[PDB]
Design a protein around this nucleic acid. Structure first.
Ligand SMILES: [Mg+2]
Ligand SMILES: [Mg+2]
Ligand SMILES: [Mg+2]
Ligand SMILES: [Mg+2]
Ligand SMILES: [Mg+2]
Ligand SMILES: [Mg+2]
Ligand SMILES: [Mg+2]
Ligand SMILES: [Mg+2]
Ligand SMILES: [Mg+2]
Ligand SMILES: [Mg+2]
Ligand SMILES: [Mg+2]
Ligand SMILES: [Mg+2]
Ligand SMILES: [Mg+2]
Ligand SMILES: [Mg+2]
Ligand SMILES: [Mg+2]
Ligand SMILES: [Mg+2]
Ligand SMILES: [Mg+2]
Ligand SMILES: [Mg+2]
Ligand SMILES: [Mg+2]
Ligand SMILES: [Mg+2]
Ligand SMILES: [Mg+2]
Ligand SMILES: [Mg+2]
Ligand SMILES: [Mg+2]
Ligand SMILES: [Zn+2]
Lengths: 213, 61, 135, 25, 101
RNA sequence: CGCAAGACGGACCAGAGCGAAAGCAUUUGCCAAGAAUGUUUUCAUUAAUCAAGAACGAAAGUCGGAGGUUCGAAGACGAUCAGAUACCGUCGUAGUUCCGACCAUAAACGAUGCCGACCGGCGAUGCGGCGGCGUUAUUCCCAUGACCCGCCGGGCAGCUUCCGGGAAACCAAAGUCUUUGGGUUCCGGGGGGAGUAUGGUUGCAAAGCUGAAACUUAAAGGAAUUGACGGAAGGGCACCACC
């Protein structure tokens, strides 16, 4: 009868200054009829963007969740809300004749952002190894998991969210964990695979404007 | 568009009763191109086939 | 009626393809997945319960949704392929591949493909009992 | 007859006897 | 008359193994006895590969793969012909079939 | 995009590990227990198997409380069918989950009691210990982790053998048996009646343990062989098959 898309308007959504590419696409929202404000419905939206769409030379199997925080006149301004890996990367990392070690921590940044970090690693077969399996004993697994937890804790609570995302973009935490765990048992495919937002500070416009420039 | 192709090699006999023939065909316009086709009727090497739709490919045996 | 975008740049959306063994869904949303552009199911095309999951119905639904979203101004689509998941099968239905190919036929640009089938770490008891479905 | 169902029939018959052959009687 | 020395399962030096559910019929079958199959395939089929490679916005964009673990009971494995009966002498041979060309 | 409840810990997960057996898989902490290996420590026969008597004992079931997501006996429907009171589909009650009391039964199986000695090879695998060129990490050094080549001791198994057994299938034990004796516990005597009746005993109940006879019958049964069949698998042929 009446077209619902004649009352729709298009907005442009921006990524924070941390990433090179800023325009991450567009979005749609119904105009304000006085009952419902378009801004209220516009906020709180989550976008999963591949890292290759945010940085030119970075990998594509790492995705970032960005949440709209403020609207500035046809310019939605987002903030970091999460990070994850693609399904096929995780499915191809897990193999049958090796050991997998996983760890998770809850760390609060200096600016109030509470994060939950997950890390995963796999035992690596030796170059001249003849034995089919590469299994780590339980005590070695516990040592490796503790080494993961301490490294993940020491790289978040000291820094703030802006530096945390900077470390997450190339995933230097995984490289540090992999290097530190060489003596216990060699590990490959070490990554921080998921990051969750647990508690946010009170919303501040100045913080967002500094985050976007 | 309609394309012409040349039969390069006869592969085998397909079909429930073996009525169809599986062959390899190369396009006249682009000699590099080659696909696998199912043909109805007697066909040998060197025949020219008229492909009304040249994108489809057949599951070889 | 749509975004003001230059010819060079492509407007992106997300296409959720739900391929079951009984029905097929092609859904188009914005990048946040909160706004629906067009949703067409395989049961709208064929007036029979047999052919809802057929490749033909999926092909028709893909063309319908492609035309509808091309009207509004979306030229490229990201693909989120989904199976039924849960306790049941993880294998996509027979309509997913045909729907995706038809969506490519209609001139739509294809973004990144991603599997989004829900996978439990462990779940409730599956329907059927100890001896399974005896047909 | 399957031995399991034969055993079940014997048990049901014994229960029926026990109900009829009351200890009070 | 025992048909197999290992009783058709892989249970050695333990009492109980937790059961899983057949992918086909949802029957409860012990994990060691069940027939497992790891399937790694392409999301798009052969023709769809060529159809999609032209319509993609990226250059040499690699299509994602599908990884599935399938569990079958004996009846479903036999009926689907993923497992067949063999000769009395050939039953002992437990080398996987030569799929590598 | 969030919230709430309950149940389960995928992939990694293996003819791998632990436990007397039932059985045991998210992280961390605490508590007590244990096998194996190392030992130029200590006691000095303290040992093996076991009537009586005890602890534990899947699932289902019973009695009280707490929760009830999923599944789901019974039940109500829709289909199928000559007929279905079944298989299939929609719902759904006990139950499935936790605590406290009962129940003591499974193809509870390696269908194979425990302790000890002897009797062929081979390659792996898990734990502990010992020895040795050489690659890697702890920026240097030993030393300790990851690999590599060996040896010893327990453990789960595998391949091979005219060791020898057996009716054979098969078994390095199911061998060392008419060339018959290492110790010890339980237990069988053609097939049915029948694990039934009765007595005793335990339990709230369901039922558990012990457990006959009258009568009837010339076979029942094990392993293997050749055929015939199969709504079992794979090949081949035929215009009295098809295309
Ligand atoms: Mg249907
Ligand atoms: Mg339907
Ligand atoms: Mg059947
Ligand atoms: Mg038999
Ligand atoms: Mg058992
Ligand atoms: Mg098997
Ligand atoms: Mg043991
Ligand atoms: Mg797990
Ligand atoms: Mg006793
Ligand atoms: Mg119980
Ligand atoms: Mg119970
Ligand atoms: Mg109760
Ligand atoms: Mg139900
Ligand atoms: Mg018994
Ligand atoms: Mg058994
Ligand atoms: Mg027994
Ligand atoms: Mg050994
Ligand atoms: Mg061990
Ligand atoms: Mg060792
Ligand atoms: Mg004797
Ligand atoms: Mg007798
Ligand atoms: Mg005739
Ligand atoms: Mg004819
Ligand atoms: Zn099955």
């Amino acid at each position: 009868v009446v077209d619902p898309f004649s009352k729709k308007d298009w907005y442009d959504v921006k990524a924070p200054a941390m990433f090179n590419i800023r325009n991450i696409g567009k979005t749609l929202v119904t105009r304000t009829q006085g009952t419902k404000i378009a801004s209220d419905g516009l906020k709180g939206r989550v976008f999963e963007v591949s890292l290759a769409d945010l940085q030119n030379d970075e990998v594509a199997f790492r995705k970032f969740k960005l949440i709209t925080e403020d609207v500035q006149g046809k310019n939605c301004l987002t903030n970091f809300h999460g990070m994850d890996l693609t399904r096929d990367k995780m499915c191809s990392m897990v193999k049958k004749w090796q050991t997998m070690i996983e760890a998770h921590v809850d760390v609060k940044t200096t600016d109030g952002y509470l994060l939950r970090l997950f890390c995963v690693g796999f035992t690596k077969k030796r170059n001249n190894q003849i034995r089919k399996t590469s299994y780590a004993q339980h005590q070695q697994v516990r040592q490796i998991r503790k080494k993961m937890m301490e490294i993940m804790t020491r790289e978040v609570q000291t820094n703030d969210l802006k530096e945390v995302v900077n470390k997450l973009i190339p995933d230097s935490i995984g490289k540090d964990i992999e290097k530190a765990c060489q003596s216990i048992y060699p590990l490959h495919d070490v990554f921080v695979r998921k990051v969750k937002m647990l508690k946010k500070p009170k919303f501040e416009l100045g913080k967002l404007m500094e985050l976007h420039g | 568009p309609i394309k012409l192709a040349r039969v390069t090699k006869v592969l085998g006999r397909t079909g429930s009763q073996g009525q169809c023939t599986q062959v390899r065909v190369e396009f006249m316009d682009d000699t590099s191109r080659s696909i696998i086709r199912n043909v109805k009727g007697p066909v040998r090497e060197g025949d020219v086939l008229t492909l009304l739709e040249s994108e489809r490919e057949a599951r070889r045996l | 009626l749509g975004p003001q975008v230059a010819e060079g740049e492509n407007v992106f959306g997300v296409c959720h393809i739900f391929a079951s063994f009984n029905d097929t869904f092609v859904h188009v949303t914005d990048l946040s997945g909160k706004e629906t552009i067009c949703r067409v199911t395989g049961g709208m095309k064929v007036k029979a319960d047999r052919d809802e999951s057929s490749p033909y119905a999926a092909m028709l639904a893909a063309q319908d949704v492609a035309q509808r979203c091309k009207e509004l101004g979306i030229t490229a689509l990201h693909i989120k392929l989904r199976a039924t998941g849960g306790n049941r099968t993880k294998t996509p239905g027979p309509g997913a591949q045909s729907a995706l190919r038809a969506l490519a036929r209609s001139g739509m640009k294809i973004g990144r493909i991603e599997d989004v089938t829900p996978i439990p770490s462990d779940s409730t008891r599956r329907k059927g009992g100890r001896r399974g479905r005896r047909l | 007859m399957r031995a399991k169902w034969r055993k079940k029939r014997m048990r049901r018959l014994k229960r029926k006897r026990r109900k009829m052959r009351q200890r009070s009687k | 008359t025992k048909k197999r020395r290992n009783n058709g399962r892989a249970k050695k030096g333990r009492g109980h193994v937790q059961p899983i559910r057949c992918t086909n019929c949802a029957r409860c079958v012990p994990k060691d006895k069940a027939i497992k199959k790891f399937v790694i395939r392409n999301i798009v089929e052969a023709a769809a590969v060529r159809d999609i490679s032209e319509a993609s916005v990226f250059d040499a964009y690699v299509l994602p793969k599908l990884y599935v673990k399938l569990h079958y009971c004996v009846s479903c494995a036999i009926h689907s012909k993923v497992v067949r009966n063999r000769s009395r002498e050939a039953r002992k041979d437990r080398t996987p079939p030569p799929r590598f060309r």
